[PDB]
Symmetry: C2
Subunit: 133 residues, 2 copies
């Protein structure tokens, strides 16, 4: 991969990626319109960047999303295709940053940046076990 | 609403709020350690802000998330209690910005800002239906 390169990730929004599906536990949500949740959009942006950086990982490595900083300016009902465009902003050792944007074929729905960190998966897993009840 | 107003809520992370649950579709995320997804943390942070604003909305009003800008620097397995605090930092027109932070009892897991917009609900819903394939 190269800095300034763009990677695209296409995802048709299904009925189960709406606000109420992010937190079915939430009475305060279950009257939101049936639209693509910001939290799901963040996940889609991470997923796009994960794919983009795959040819960069070595065996035994994964990555974490360590920062997300984006707008969400238009709502997307199920049925539309959301395309995330990830542009590599920098890569240095275990750190990588991306400019991200998303569009649903009708509106640009949001944009900003995302940062990820390469991790040793097994080391990470162990750390998580150290926190597990 | 008064700048400085804070609201806090607690959330025991259940098994179905891990990364693999945000996007089961992702062959990529299926691999992943069983930790609270960034997207779910964002939703919990938005949920805090939604609750904090509710008392001040007139009938027929709702709000939409318009920006999220957070770090997520420590991972959380199911079973831990995540505490989210939201503090109103600014109000301008129909828009409110909150300082948000989350802690799982061991680590501060993320922090940053979230912006929302107060909207006319019905109008918004109609617009969504008009954008629906």
């Amino acid at each position: 991969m190269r800095v300034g390169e763009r990677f695209t990730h296409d995802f048709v929004v299904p009925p189960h990626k709406t606000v109420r599906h992010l937190y079915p536990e939430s009475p305060e949500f279950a009257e939101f319109p049936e639209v693509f949740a910001t939290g799901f959009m963040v996940g889609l942006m991470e997923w796009a960047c994960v794919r983009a950086m795959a040819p960069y990982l070595e065996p035994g490595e994964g990555s974490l999303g360590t920062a997300i900083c984006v707008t969400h300016t238009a709502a997307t009902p199920p049925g539309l295709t959301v395309t995330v465009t990830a542009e590599l902003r920098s890569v240095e050792g275990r750190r990588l940053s991306w400019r991200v944007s998303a569009h649903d074929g009708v509106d640009e729905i949001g944009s900003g940046t995302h940062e990820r960190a390469v991790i040793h998966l097994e080391k990470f897993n162990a750390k998580v076990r150290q926190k597990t009840p």
